[PDB]
Amino acid sequence: AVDFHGYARSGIGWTGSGGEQQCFQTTGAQSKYRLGNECETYAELKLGQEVWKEGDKSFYFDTNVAYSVAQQNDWEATDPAFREANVQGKNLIEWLPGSTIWAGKRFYQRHDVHMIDFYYWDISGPGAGLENIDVGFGKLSLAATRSSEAGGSSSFASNNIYDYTNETANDVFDVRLAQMEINPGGTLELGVDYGRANLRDNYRLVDGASKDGWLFTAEHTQSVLKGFNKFVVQYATDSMTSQGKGLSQGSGVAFDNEKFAYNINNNGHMLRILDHGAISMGDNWDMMYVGMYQDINWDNDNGTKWWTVGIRPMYKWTPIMSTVMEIGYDNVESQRTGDKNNQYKITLAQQWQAGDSIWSRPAIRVFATYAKWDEKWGYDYNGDSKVNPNYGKAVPADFNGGSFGRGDSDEWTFGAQMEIWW
Amino acid sequence: AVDFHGYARSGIGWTGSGGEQQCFQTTGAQSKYRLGNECETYAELKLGQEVWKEGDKSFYFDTNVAYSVAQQNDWEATDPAFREANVQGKNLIEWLPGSTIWAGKRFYQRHDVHMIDFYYWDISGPGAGLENIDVGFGKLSLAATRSSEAGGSSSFASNNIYDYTNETANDVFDVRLAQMEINPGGTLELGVDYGRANLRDNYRLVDGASKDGWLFTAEHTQSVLKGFNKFVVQYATDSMTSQGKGLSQGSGVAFDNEKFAYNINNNGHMLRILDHGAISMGDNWDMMYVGMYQDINWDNDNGTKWWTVGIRPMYKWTPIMSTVMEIGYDNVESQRTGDKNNQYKITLAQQWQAGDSIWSRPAIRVFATYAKWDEKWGYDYNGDSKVNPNYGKAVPADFNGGSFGRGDSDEWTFGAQMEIWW
Amino acid sequence: AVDFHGYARSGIGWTGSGGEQQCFQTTGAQSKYRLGNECETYAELKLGQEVWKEGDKSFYFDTNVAYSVAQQNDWEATDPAFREANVQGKNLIEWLPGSTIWAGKRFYQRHDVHMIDFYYWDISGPGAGLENIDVGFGKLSLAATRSSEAGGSSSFASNNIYDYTNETANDVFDVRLAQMEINPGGTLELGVDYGRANLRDNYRLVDGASKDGWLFTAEHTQSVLKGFNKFVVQYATDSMTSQGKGLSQGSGVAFDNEKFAYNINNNGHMLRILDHGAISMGDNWDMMYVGMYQDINWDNDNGTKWWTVGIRPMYKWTPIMSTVMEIGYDNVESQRTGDKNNQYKITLAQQWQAGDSIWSRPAIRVFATYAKWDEKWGYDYNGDSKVNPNYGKAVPADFNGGSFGRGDSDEWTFGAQMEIWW
Amino acid sequence: HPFDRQIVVLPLTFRGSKRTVSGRTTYSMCYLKVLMNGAVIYDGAANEAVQVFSRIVDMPAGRGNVILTFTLTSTRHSADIPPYTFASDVQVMVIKKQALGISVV
Amino acid sequence: HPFDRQIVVLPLTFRGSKRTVSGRTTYSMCYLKVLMNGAVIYDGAANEAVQVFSRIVDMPAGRGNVILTFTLTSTRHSADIPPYTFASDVQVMVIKKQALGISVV
């Protein structure tokens, strides 16, 4: 009675100028338009089981192993990620009917925009929680989750950043109040995340480290046109700004190309306004859309302003065959320099899908993608942090005769790809 | 008709002194009490199948892949262990009814103590055998298994230990006579294991290597108070003493931190007297209990004398919810220094389990653990084997200004966990 | 409704001289007689599922993860190969009933000799295609697949081979026409594969590289004696001769053991005449046979001329138990040196299988193998491509006082094994 | 000396270490700081890969004595694991610049 | 010479190798043994990483001739694969100690 679930994507592609497929993402952006822009094959295989059930009480056990290979060969040995292994007991507590007590490594209530493949509320990982408490007007969920950074802690009082190489754990405490009916056909959900860096005994962080941070999020879901529209506003402070999805990095220390610690301090704030949805028009048109503005303002001046606007309409020739288009525009302005790099991508595909909706998966698509970009800044990662004072910092495209970013250019690719979730 | 089985444990934890959860084990002990004391996320997944069946004759195929991650992040790349892949044919021999012929990598008839998570008879690995031969009074099982060491063999005649770096193979041959009825409710099982180092042609071991060893085990299991009590006596000689569960390491050579060979010669004997069991008192009380004495006497004096005493009671308020305590005591005396490391640990947990027994798994616990230890000796693993003459040797905690062992201290942790076997 | 399929082999073995089981394959030959010669534990697990089915149209999703371990220990960490992840849609096109559109990483229509474990037509990998097109007389299939080499491409105009260390992508375009009825019981199949190295912009191959090549395959399957007989003729030119199974390697450079590039230029051709089959005589005798001549003629004079001939009879005492003998002979002549090295092996096994055919699997074998070889040439692979000017080239077995090849000797092994496909 | 000279510091190799215990990886870093007359002229760090420091310091005639200070510090893995680093000896030669036999350009 | 001297052995880099064939890993170790007047003063081994030997031997005045023996041995991967090791030249200088030109403290 094993439950087989998961996700998968894989295909083949060629670049018009020569070589294997190239996937385009403007520097400074944290996401790219996924249709016709997948550089690799990714699978998540989940083998679950309802191991015990009496009346309404039950125990469910779920695993998830993820593989990510480069689709260049048949034998591609990799390091599979044991991403999830957890047990959830449902209806066990009588004082709070309908609630669940869960423990383990879990994909805890991930919110994402599918078109850009961008998670904006994702605190997944090892944790434990009490979920779906009926509080009357809404449903209350409490959770505690763990993250970790490969460095940031020193065993002794040192002023040398190279000494801060010890892995440091972080704790996220999350409380969400969801399903609050405030509108006819529309619901509201609020969420508060507090992230902290849990240091060991006689261990310390670099001076000026954020050491903790906050994340406040509000999301309104409105059901219109046989689809949905989600409008979300998020505000993160300090250690919660490096990732922006709900996990904390309070150390502010990274490992460069040669495994030497260097300062990526993230004191500041981040404001994200997002509106994404899926809409059915007529009996033959479906359309995904996203529009988002994200501003990361850091105290070391390395933040970014990011504008994203994209649509993906699909026309149904037949309950299994459809023609999909995707037009997306990205514009990122640096804080250190002030330069703007932007890109626009147009993808046209013909796809066969197992259903009549834009969300219907087992899909096989033959696509042609065209991206045009210009880029006035990039990140300096040449050499190493010991000899490069600008390592990891945003610098203009021709700083002191360098070549940073992707420049002003244009490219087109094509190929075939399968995508499925089951 | 795939059979999905396996085991898993995972959770989250904190320590009072600060940091991620720390799990406590006395120096010189080969096990730690497991309630609220697991440092990692572990999961064995087994996808078996009955591929053929005619009358009573049957063929069963079994697999097992294991993942062990540090439960510090969501994405944890890992090298999974391919633990089992084997085929067992049952009732295939007309002469011997009920006997099964098996071949492959197998978890072959492992005996273990659950509280300390300690296997005392584990010869699992690649091999083949004929099992469950009915001989009247009992059941006779014969098996052959292979283990290996990363070094120990030299291709040429040499006196430099650094030249003994080629991997060596060991064979174990196991004969077991089980299910003897001696007293009403009592069952006896005897076992003899012979282990030897299988040297490649024109290959040799260091002078004075054990090169072979014996393991004699006698276990009596009695059914009492709706549970059981197992009293086992084990005696190992030479190459079977280094590991102590039934595999041989006859080379007596180990790699140091920098991959240099050094001598870990295991000439001597090991005596293990163990008594562990599970008892049920009333309709509300359950208990696991453990008593172990293991004396490893080596010719180089690097042996140990380990006493372990443990109790784990469980009180069931409701058929789902219970409170579980556990008190454990370890005391290990080093052979070459004469010092003693002792520790006692008390953990209290509240757990929800899928059943009314101490063995009912899908179990979610919230626990608080307190361990107090005093260690007067430790192992010197500083540097490498070339520059350190005490590398791998037991030394007093205050040896020439060094600090060995965990010292004298105490620590309290807490958190949540899930354990399941299905 | 998850479908669990795949393949596995695993066992235990000893060598007569001493140590673990040794594995005998002639130098120059690309395969070895596998009965009693399989050297490691191998297992491909496939978790497939039909996720959508309507009328005649269907969507099938298939995965395949493969593990290969040395079967020397219980805990054996490995890097599994994500070998397949693909989606196939059947009867999705009304113009071509019965055809399938597939995309992903696939094991695409492999042809093999089981006796020697030899894939003589295998273009598996990432790709996409349209297959099983009914054209009247036969069935036409078109596919595109990607392969890759770890080096062979330079970022700039260079004359130093050490500069050609960049991954080179190769494309294979395959057209097959199968199932021609040319005689009673006989079926003809013709395939054409064109392979070419795909170079990124401003990237170049070494001077004189093969770049692109061809493979032509003709295969005849005859249904005789309750079994089959396949006679195949294959002609490969240029980049398709290095591997010879339908994948292209058009760069001509490879990495040595210290990650330095060196030239393995494969200009030339390869002729392969093969005849393999499996028949059943009487109701008690089964038979496998193989005979193959493969001439790889290169321009750097480093090809080979390989004669293989082997039989594998099987006598069935019982519908469960049988005795299998396998006799094989290999003779490889070097093009560079003109020396011929040869080997013959005879193995006798007793096996219990799930069926009355030689193709019936869940098989447990107890085997004893003998193999006698005389080797007059070998491959020079000691040192570096820099210090050694003969690196990778065939040299006589006594070249300037060196020892190349396995010499003139014989060896016998024995043990047990399980093999299964389900 | 009446003419300018060259102080050549021959290749000095220093190296740290990395050690994994119970799945936790720790570093022992080797720092070499080289000062000319109190002015920092080299600041090198090593974790696993060896680092080689060799230099030429031009000392002119009449300016005064040249003092080269080599300070090497080693960081420990933890509070109970001592540092495990390596550093070769410091060997310094003094040569003439524009000598008779050898001439380098 | 009428004054004590220092025999400095300049950095000598020796290194072994590791080769993996058919999943079986073999080492080729490089052993360097340095004797002063027949007494072992250095005994080093290299497997994969380079090892650097550089030393100061204090020879006083009137004690007698100083003999430094450098023996280097290489072990093969197996009976068929020859050793693959590297070892740089042995270079020895003799200096004055407590000289007035260069001083070292």
Side-chain angles (χ1 to χ4, degrees), chain A residues 156 160 162-163 165-167 200 258-260 386, chain D residues 24 27 29 31 45-47 51 75 77-78:
Chain A
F156 72 111
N160 199 23
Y162 304 136
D163 289 336
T165 52
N166 307 275
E167 154 152 3
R200 314 214 327 193
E258 295 285 332
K259 302 302 289 209
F260 285 102
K386 277 192 298 151
Chain D
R24 155 177 269 271
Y27 290 87
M29 323 273 312
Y31 312 110
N47 48 359
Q51 307 261 318
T75 256
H77 290 270
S78 329

PDB file of all heavy atoms in Angstrom, chain A residues 156 160 162-163 165-167 200 258-260 386, chain D residues 24 27 29 31 45-47 51 75 77-78:
ATOM      1  N   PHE A 156      37.236  30.607  19.494  1.00  0.00           N
ATOM      2  CA  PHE A 156      37.965  31.491  20.389  1.00  0.00           C
ATOM      3  C   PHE A 156      37.764  32.930  19.939  1.00  0.00           C
ATOM      4  O   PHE A 156      37.374  33.198  18.800  1.00  0.00           O
ATOM      5  CB  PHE A 156      39.456  31.140  20.439  1.00  0.00           C
ATOM      6  CG  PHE A 156      40.207  31.493  19.190  1.00  0.00           C
ATOM      7  CD1 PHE A 156      41.146  32.507  19.199  1.00  0.00           C
ATOM      8  CD2 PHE A 156      39.989  30.800  18.013  1.00  0.00           C
ATOM      9  CE1 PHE A 156      41.845  32.829  18.055  1.00  0.00           C
ATOM     10  CE2 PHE A 156      40.683  31.118  16.867  1.00  0.00           C
ATOM     11  CZ  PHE A 156      41.613  32.134  16.888  1.00  0.00           C
ATOM     12  N   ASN A 160      39.996  37.781  13.248  1.00  0.00           N
ATOM     13  CA  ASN A 160      40.328  37.360  11.894  1.00  0.00           C
ATOM     14  C   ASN A 160      39.178  36.537  11.331  1.00  0.00           C
ATOM     15  O   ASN A 160      38.830  35.489  11.887  1.00  0.00           O
ATOM     16  CB  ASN A 160      41.626  36.554  11.884  1.00  0.00           C
ATOM     17  CG  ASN A 160      42.262  36.496  10.515  1.00  0.00           C
ATOM     18  OD1 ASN A 160      42.013  37.349   9.665  1.00  0.00           O
ATOM     19  ND2 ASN A 160      43.093  35.488  10.294  1.00  0.00           N
ATOM     20  N   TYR A 162      39.030  34.647   8.883  1.00  0.00           N
ATOM     21  CA  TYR A 162      39.430  33.302   8.493  1.00  0.00           C
ATOM     22  C   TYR A 162      39.231  32.296   9.615  1.00  0.00           C
ATOM     23  O   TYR A 162      39.165  31.092   9.348  1.00  0.00           O
ATOM     24  CB  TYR A 162      40.892  33.297   8.052  1.00  0.00           C
ATOM     25  CG  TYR A 162      41.190  34.267   6.936  1.00  0.00           C
ATOM     26  CD1 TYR A 162      42.320  35.066   6.972  1.00  0.00           C
ATOM     27  CD2 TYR A 162      40.334  34.392   5.852  1.00  0.00           C
ATOM     28  CE1 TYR A 162      42.594  35.958   5.960  1.00  0.00           C
ATOM     29  CE2 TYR A 162      40.600  35.282   4.834  1.00  0.00           C
ATOM     30  CZ  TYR A 162      41.732  36.063   4.894  1.00  0.00           C
ATOM     31  OH  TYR A 162      42.005  36.954   3.884  1.00  0.00           O
ATOM     32  N   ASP A 163      39.131  32.760  10.859  1.00  0.00           N
ATOM     33  CA  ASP A 163      38.905  31.868  11.987  1.00  0.00           C
ATOM     34  C   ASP A 163      37.450  31.447  12.129  1.00  0.00           C
ATOM     35  O   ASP A 163      37.168  30.510  12.881  1.00  0.00           O
ATOM     36  CB  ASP A 163      39.369  32.538  13.280  1.00  0.00           C
ATOM     37  CG  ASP A 163      40.873  32.650  13.365  1.00  0.00           C
ATOM     38  OD1 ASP A 163      41.566  31.855  12.699  1.00  0.00           O
ATOM     39  OD2 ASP A 163      41.366  33.538  14.089  1.00  0.00           O
ATOM     40  N   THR A 165      35.104  29.564  10.756  1.00  0.00           N
ATOM     41  CA  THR A 165      34.867  28.472   9.823  1.00  0.00           C
ATOM     42  C   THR A 165      33.979  27.368  10.378  1.00  0.00           C
ATOM     43  O   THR A 165      33.709  26.399   9.660  1.00  0.00           O
ATOM     44  CB  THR A 165      36.200  27.858   9.372  1.00  0.00           C
ATOM     45  OG1 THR A 165      36.987  27.525  10.521  1.00  0.00           O
ATOM     46  CG2 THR A 165      36.972  28.833   8.508  1.00  0.00           C
ATOM     47  N   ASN A 166      33.520  27.474  11.621  1.00  0.00           N
ATOM     48  CA  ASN A 166      32.718  26.417  12.219  1.00  0.00           C
ATOM     49  C   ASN A 166      31.255  26.558  11.822  1.00  0.00           C
ATOM     50  O   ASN A 166      30.701  27.660  11.808  1.00  0.00           O
ATOM     51  CB  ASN A 166      32.852  26.441  13.740  1.00  0.00           C
ATOM     52  CG  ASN A 166      34.293  26.413  14.195  1.00  0.00           C
ATOM     53  OD1 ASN A 166      34.895  25.348  14.318  1.00  0.00           O
ATOM     54  ND2 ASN A 166      34.857  27.587  14.443  1.00  0.00           N
ATOM     55  N   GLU A 167      30.633  25.428  11.497  1.00  0.00           N
ATOM     56  CA  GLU A 167      29.238  25.425  11.081  1.00  0.00           C
ATOM     57  C   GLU A 167      28.345  25.923  12.210  1.00  0.00           C
ATOM     58  O   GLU A 167      28.522  25.552  13.373  1.00  0.00           O
ATOM     59  CB  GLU A 167      28.829  24.017  10.651  1.00  0.00           C
ATOM     60  CG  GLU A 167      27.353  23.704  10.783  1.00  0.00           C
ATOM     61  CD  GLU A 167      26.898  22.654   9.793  1.00  0.00           C
ATOM     62  OE1 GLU A 167      27.751  22.130   9.046  1.00  0.00           O
ATOM     63  OE2 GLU A 167      25.688  22.352   9.758  1.00  0.00           O
ATOM     64  N   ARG A 200      26.914  27.591  20.053  1.00  0.00           N
ATOM     65  CA  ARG A 200      27.262  26.617  21.078  1.00  0.00           C
ATOM     66  C   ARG A 200      27.895  27.340  22.263  1.00  0.00           C
ATOM     67  O   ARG A 200      27.902  28.571  22.341  1.00  0.00           O
ATOM     68  CB  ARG A 200      28.177  25.542  20.501  1.00  0.00           C
ATOM     69  CG  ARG A 200      27.729  25.001  19.161  1.00  0.00           C
ATOM     70  CD  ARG A 200      28.061  23.527  19.026  1.00  0.00           C
ATOM     71  NE  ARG A 200      29.290  23.183  19.730  1.00  0.00           N
ATOM     72  CZ  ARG A 200      29.946  22.041  19.577  1.00  0.00           C
ATOM     73  NH1 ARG A 200      29.518  21.104  18.748  1.00  0.00           N
ATOM     74  NH2 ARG A 200      31.059  21.835  20.274  1.00  0.00           N
ATOM     75  N   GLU A 258      38.160  29.018  -2.464  1.00  0.00           N
ATOM     76  CA  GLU A 258      39.239  28.261  -1.847  1.00  0.00           C
ATOM     77  C   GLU A 258      38.957  27.927  -0.386  1.00  0.00           C
ATOM     78  O   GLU A 258      39.889  27.605   0.358  1.00  0.00           O
ATOM     79  CB  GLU A 258      40.556  29.024  -1.974  1.00  0.00           C
ATOM     80  CG  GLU A 258      41.031  29.191  -3.407  1.00  0.00           C
ATOM     81  CD  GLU A 258      41.604  27.910  -3.984  1.00  0.00           C
ATOM     82  OE1 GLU A 258      42.126  27.086  -3.203  1.00  0.00           O
ATOM     83  OE2 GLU A 258      41.531  27.724  -5.216  1.00  0.00           O
ATOM     84  N   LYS A 259      37.694  28.006   0.034  1.00  0.00           N
ATOM     85  CA  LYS A 259      37.274  27.655   1.392  1.00  0.00           C
ATOM     86  C   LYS A 259      37.938  28.552   2.436  1.00  0.00           C
ATOM     87  O   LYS A 259      38.492  28.086   3.432  1.00  0.00           O
ATOM     88  CB  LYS A 259      37.540  26.177   1.688  1.00  0.00           C
ATOM     89  CG  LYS A 259      36.847  25.223   0.736  1.00  0.00           C
ATOM     90  CD  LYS A 259      35.345  25.437   0.745  1.00  0.00           C
ATOM     91  CE  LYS A 259      34.729  24.959   2.049  1.00  0.00           C
ATOM     92  NZ  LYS A 259      33.327  24.496   1.860  1.00  0.00           N
ATOM     93  N   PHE A 260      37.878  29.858   2.195  1.00  0.00           N
ATOM     94  CA  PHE A 260      38.289  30.867   3.161  1.00  0.00           C
ATOM     95  C   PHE A 260      37.074  31.715   3.505  1.00  0.00           C
ATOM     96  O   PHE A 260      36.354  32.162   2.607  1.00  0.00           O
ATOM     97  CB  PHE A 260      39.416  31.743   2.610  1.00  0.00           C
ATOM     98  CG  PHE A 260      40.757  31.068   2.589  1.00  0.00           C
ATOM     99  CD1 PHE A 260      41.274  30.562   1.411  1.00  0.00           C
ATOM    100  CD2 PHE A 260      41.501  30.941   3.749  1.00  0.00           C
ATOM    101  CE1 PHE A 260      42.502  29.939   1.390  1.00  0.00           C
ATOM    102  CE2 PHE A 260      42.730  30.320   3.732  1.00  0.00           C
ATOM    103  CZ  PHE A 260      43.231  29.820   2.552  1.00  0.00           C
ATOM    104  N   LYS A 386      40.953  36.330  -0.278  1.00  0.00           N
ATOM    105  CA  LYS A 386      42.189  36.817   0.327  1.00  0.00           C
ATOM    106  C   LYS A 386      42.818  37.924  -0.508  1.00  0.00           C
ATOM    107  O   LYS A 386      43.286  38.931   0.037  1.00  0.00           O
ATOM    108  CB  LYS A 386      43.175  35.663   0.503  1.00  0.00           C
ATOM    109  CG  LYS A 386      42.959  34.826   1.747  1.00  0.00           C
ATOM    110  CD  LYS A 386      44.139  33.903   1.980  1.00  0.00           C
ATOM    111  CE  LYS A 386      44.295  32.922   0.832  1.00  0.00           C
ATOM    112  NZ  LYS A 386      45.711  32.514   0.635  1.00  0.00           N
TER     113      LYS A 386
ATOM    114  N   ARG D  24      31.524  16.492  12.007  1.00  0.00           N
ATOM    115  CA  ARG D  24      31.805  17.916  12.116  1.00  0.00           C
ATOM    116  C   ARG D  24      33.223  18.176  11.631  1.00  0.00           C
ATOM    117  O   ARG D  24      34.172  17.549  12.112  1.00  0.00           O
ATOM    118  CB  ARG D  24      31.631  18.398  13.559  1.00  0.00           C
ATOM    119  CG  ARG D  24      32.442  19.632  13.908  1.00  0.00           C
ATOM    120  CD  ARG D  24      32.167  20.093  15.328  1.00  0.00           C
ATOM    121  NE  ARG D  24      31.078  21.061  15.395  1.00  0.00           N
ATOM    122  CZ  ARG D  24      31.233  22.373  15.279  1.00  0.00           C
ATOM    123  NH1 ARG D  24      32.424  22.913  15.076  1.00  0.00           N
ATOM    124  NH2 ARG D  24      30.167  23.163  15.367  1.00  0.00           N
ATOM    125  N   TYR D  27      38.923  23.273  11.038  1.00  0.00           N
ATOM    126  CA  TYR D  27      40.128  23.725  10.362  1.00  0.00           C
ATOM    127  C   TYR D  27      41.172  24.165  11.377  1.00  0.00           C
ATOM    128  O   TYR D  27      40.845  24.700  12.440  1.00  0.00           O
ATOM    129  CB  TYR D  27      39.837  24.896   9.420  1.00  0.00           C
ATOM    130  CG  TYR D  27      39.030  24.542   8.199  1.00  0.00           C
ATOM    131  CD1 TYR D  27      37.643  24.538   8.236  1.00  0.00           C
ATOM    132  CD2 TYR D  27      39.653  24.232   7.003  1.00  0.00           C
ATOM    133  CE1 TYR D  27      36.902  24.225   7.117  1.00  0.00           C
ATOM    134  CE2 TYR D  27      38.920  23.921   5.882  1.00  0.00           C
ATOM    135  CZ  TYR D  27      37.547  23.916   5.942  1.00  0.00           C
ATOM    136  OH  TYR D  27      36.816  23.602   4.820  1.00  0.00           O
ATOM    137  N   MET D  29      44.280  26.673  10.882  1.00  0.00           N
ATOM    138  CA  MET D  29      44.816  27.609   9.905  1.00  0.00           C
ATOM    139  C   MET D  29      46.213  28.056  10.306  1.00  0.00           C
ATOM    140  O   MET D  29      46.492  28.273  11.489  1.00  0.00           O
ATOM    141  CB  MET D  29      43.904  28.828   9.761  1.00  0.00           C
ATOM    142  CG  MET D  29      42.426  28.511   9.857  1.00  0.00           C
ATOM    143  SD  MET D  29      41.749  28.045   8.258  1.00  0.00           S
ATOM    144  CE  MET D  29      42.397  29.366   7.241  1.00  0.00           C
ATOM    145  N   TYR D  31      48.893  31.058   9.742  1.00  0.00           N
ATOM    146  CA  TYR D  31      49.049  32.435   9.300  1.00  0.00           C
ATOM    147  C   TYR D  31      50.515  32.825   9.375  1.00  0.00           C
ATOM    148  O   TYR D  31      51.162  32.627  10.408  1.00  0.00           O
ATOM    149  CB  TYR D  31      48.215  33.391  10.153  1.00  0.00           C
ATOM    150  CG  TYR D  31      46.787  32.962  10.365  1.00  0.00           C
ATOM    151  CD1 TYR D  31      46.349  32.537  11.608  1.00  0.00           C
ATOM    152  CD2 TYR D  31      45.872  32.995   9.325  1.00  0.00           C
ATOM    153  CE1 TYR D  31      45.046  32.151  11.808  1.00  0.00           C
ATOM    154  CE2 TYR D  31      44.565  32.610   9.516  1.00  0.00           C
ATOM    155  CZ  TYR D  31      44.158  32.190  10.759  1.00  0.00           C
ATOM    156  OH  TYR D  31      42.856  31.804  10.957  1.00  0.00           O
ATOM    157  N   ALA D  45      47.620  33.021   4.585  1.00  0.00           N
ATOM    158  CA  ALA D  45      46.874  32.049   5.368  1.00  0.00           C
ATOM    159  C   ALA D  45      46.769  30.743   4.594  1.00  0.00           C
ATOM    160  O   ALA D  45      46.699  30.736   3.364  1.00  0.00           O
ATOM    161  CB  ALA D  45      45.474  32.564   5.718  1.00  0.00           C
ATOM    162  N   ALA D  46      46.767  29.633   5.330  1.00  0.00           N
ATOM    163  CA  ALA D  46      46.679  28.310   4.730  1.00  0.00           C
ATOM    164  C   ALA D  46      45.746  27.430   5.547  1.00  0.00           C
ATOM    165  O   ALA D  46      45.792  27.447   6.782  1.00  0.00           O
ATOM    166  CB  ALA D  46      48.059  27.652   4.630  1.00  0.00           C
ATOM    167  N   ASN D  47      44.898  26.665   4.853  1.00  0.00           N
ATOM    168  CA  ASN D  47      43.985  25.727   5.502  1.00  0.00           C
ATOM    169  C   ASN D  47      44.293  24.276   5.156  1.00  0.00           C
ATOM    170  O   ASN D  47      44.517  23.474   6.066  1.00  0.00           O
ATOM    171  CB  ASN D  47      42.533  26.074   5.141  1.00  0.00           C
ATOM    172  CG  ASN D  47      42.339  26.302   3.658  1.00  0.00           C
ATOM    173  OD1 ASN D  47      43.285  26.227   2.878  1.00  0.00           O
ATOM    174  ND2 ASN D  47      41.104  26.581   3.260  1.00  0.00           N
ATOM    175  N   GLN D  51      51.128  26.665   1.030  1.00  0.00           N
ATOM    176  CA  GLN D  51      51.392  27.997   0.512  1.00  0.00           C
ATOM    177  C   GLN D  51      52.885  28.256   0.590  1.00  0.00           C
ATOM    178  O   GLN D  51      53.521  27.946   1.603  1.00  0.00           O
ATOM    179  CB  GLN D  51      50.620  29.067   1.286  1.00  0.00           C
ATOM    180  CG  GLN D  51      49.133  28.805   1.388  1.00  0.00           C
ATOM    181  CD  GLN D  51      48.337  29.585   0.369  1.00  0.00           C
ATOM    182  OE1 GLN D  51      48.599  30.762   0.131  1.00  0.00           O
ATOM    183  NE2 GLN D  51      47.355  28.934  -0.240  1.00  0.00           N
ATOM    184  N   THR D  75      46.192  28.082  14.482  1.00  0.00           N
ATOM    185  CA  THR D  75      44.892  28.045  15.133  1.00  0.00           C
ATOM    186  C   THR D  75      44.475  26.598  15.359  1.00  0.00           C
ATOM    187  O   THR D  75      44.758  25.727  14.533  1.00  0.00           O
ATOM    188  CB  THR D  75      43.856  28.796  14.287  1.00  0.00           C
ATOM    189  OG1 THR D  75      43.582  30.069  14.884  1.00  0.00           O
ATOM    190  CG2 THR D  75      42.556  28.014  14.142  1.00  0.00           C
ATOM    191  N   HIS D  77      41.931  23.246  16.185  1.00  0.00           N
ATOM    192  CA  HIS D  77      40.680  22.718  15.653  1.00  0.00           C
ATOM    193  C   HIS D  77      39.515  23.036  16.581  1.00  0.00           C
ATOM    194  O   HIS D  77      38.459  23.498  16.135  1.00  0.00           O
ATOM    195  CB  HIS D  77      40.798  21.209  15.443  1.00  0.00           C
ATOM    196  CG  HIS D  77      41.703  20.823  14.315  1.00  0.00           C
ATOM    197  ND1 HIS D  77      41.253  20.660  13.024  1.00  0.00           N
ATOM    198  CD2 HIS D  77      43.030  20.561  14.287  1.00  0.00           C
ATOM    199  CE1 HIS D  77      42.265  20.320  12.246  1.00  0.00           C
ATOM    200  NE2 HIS D  77      43.355  20.251  12.989  1.00  0.00           N
ATOM    201  N   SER D  78      39.691  22.796  17.876  1.00  0.00           N
ATOM    202  CA  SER D  78      38.646  23.035  18.859  1.00  0.00           C
ATOM    203  C   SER D  78      39.308  23.432  20.172  1.00  0.00           C
ATOM    204  O   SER D  78      40.499  23.755  20.214  1.00  0.00           O
ATOM    205  CB  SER D  78      37.756  21.795  19.023  1.00  0.00           C
ATOM    206  OG  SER D  78      37.668  21.059  17.818  1.00  0.00           O
TER     207      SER D  78
END
